Design a protein around this ligand. Structure first.
Ligand SMILES: Nc1nc2c(ncn2[C@@H]2O[C@H](COP(=O)(O)OP(=O)(O)NP(=O)(O)O)[C@@H](O)[C@H]2O)c(=O)[nH]1
Ligand SMILES: [Cl-]
Ligand SMILES: [Mg+2]
Length: 360
């Protein structure tokens, strides 16, 4: 008697578990390396779980800080033409920083912060930083190098922005579950460098939607994997691969044209011309229905819409009735931007999942 009763209790439990799964939106974050996928996940935690509640991440921030200064300083003599210190008295600091580049488990002594700060204030170091698209530099370099004095304090506690800016590699598949207004979301974060893309197929089962993230600002950079392929070209080629992939033909794509702040900054700097990398930009005109933010520099508007339209040219070329691409301009480190963008996705995501039920 109690045997059949335990049994269909398990079975009522099983049926509830099936309905939870069916109604949970599985969101797969795809995009090339450093496009911003893990930062989007961190924002979902800030907005909808408990964020980072931090002391675990202090070493990661210090490692980013160290990677940034040592990368810039190492690049100075390797650029063509090389970049010289503005104050050649700083050479002994260059020597120190380069000498500790590959020490595992670095102990971050006070001289490290002293030398890093002095070098970061050197106009030559800064001129090398301004050429960083000629080498490989983490995006958070300026943010952390500007607060060396904060990070080095013994009582340093990272802010939420520090944790968002912190770059770590994503080796493997990382899941994050969260609930917004009793709707359940299940986000899958994966690495986006080329070798990590072999893992992506493991997540294609029962996907509700893809969030495809692009570093819009990286149009003048090349990928780490071969130090030759343009990063935006790689993003486009990768998006075409996803849009047309055998397993993902039914799956709609929310396209996050991310790093809008860095793109704005690169446009305003005026050094790196998009048409030097994408010659067709010279003939591109901002669309009639563009909606620039008040005061946005029209050069920025034209840039960001050109990049959007390079992706939409791919997504409009196939799939017309079977899946759709929803573009959004994003700044993944801006919590209020991601709050607004994600809220504007919740209705379309619910609709994607409902249509999936009729197809099954
Ligand atoms: N200023 C700015 N920084 C951004 C933005 N999106 C990401 N970043 C920064 O760019 C770096 C890379 O971001 P991350 O989320 O780790 O990229 P990813 O796509 O997960 N990289 P991977 O594929 O290797 O896992 C981080 O330092 C992150 O803070 C953005 O919109 N604006
Ligand atoms: Cl990218
Ligand atoms: Mg990542």
């Amino acid at each position: 008697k109690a045997q059949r009763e335990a049994n269909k209790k398990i079975e009522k439990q099983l049926q509830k578990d099936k309905q939870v799964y069916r109604a949970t939106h599985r969101l797969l974050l795809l995009g090339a390396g450093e496009s911003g996928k893990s930062t989007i996940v961190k924002q979902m935690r800030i907005l909808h779980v408990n964020g980072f509640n931090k002391a675990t991440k202090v070493q990661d921030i210090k490692n980013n800080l160290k990677e940034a200064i040592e990368t810039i300083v190492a690049a100075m003599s390797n650029l063509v033409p090389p970049v010289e210190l503005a104050n050649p008295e700083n050479q002994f600091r260059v020597d120190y920083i380069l000498s500790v580049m590959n020490v595992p488990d670095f102990d971050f002594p006070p001289e490290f912060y002293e030398h890093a700060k002095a070098l970061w204030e050197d106009e030559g170091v800064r001129a090398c930083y301004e050429r960083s698209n000629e080498y490989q530099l983490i995006d958070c370099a300026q943010y952390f190098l500007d607060k060396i004095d904060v990070i080095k304090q013994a009582d340093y506690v990272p802010s939420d922005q520090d944790l968002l800016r912190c770059r770590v590699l994503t080796s493997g598949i990382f899941e994050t579950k969260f609930q917004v207004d009793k709707v359940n979301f299940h986000m899958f974060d994966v690495g986006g460098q080329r070798d990590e893309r072999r893992k992506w197929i493991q997540c294609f089962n029962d996907v509700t939607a893809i969030i495809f993230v692009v570093a819009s600002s990286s149009y003048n950079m090349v990928i780490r994997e071969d130090n030759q392929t343009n990063r935006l070209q790689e993003a486009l080629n990768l998006f075409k691969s996803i849009w047309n992939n055998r397993w993902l033909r039914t799956i709609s794509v929310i396209l996050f044209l991310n790093k809008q702040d860095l793109l704005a900054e690169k446009v305003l700097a005026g050094k790196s011309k998009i048409e030097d990398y994408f010659p067709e930009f010279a003939r591109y005109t901002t669309p009639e229905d563009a909606t620039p933010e008040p005061g946005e520099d029209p050069r920025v508007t034209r840039a960001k819409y050109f990049i959007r339209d390079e992706f939409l040219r791919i997504s409009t070329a196939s799939g017309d009735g079977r899946h759709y691409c929803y573009p959004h301009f994003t700044c993944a480190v801006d919590t209020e931007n991601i709050r607004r963008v994600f809220n504007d996705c919740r209705d379309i995501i619910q609709r994607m999942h409902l249509r999936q039920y009729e197809l099954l």
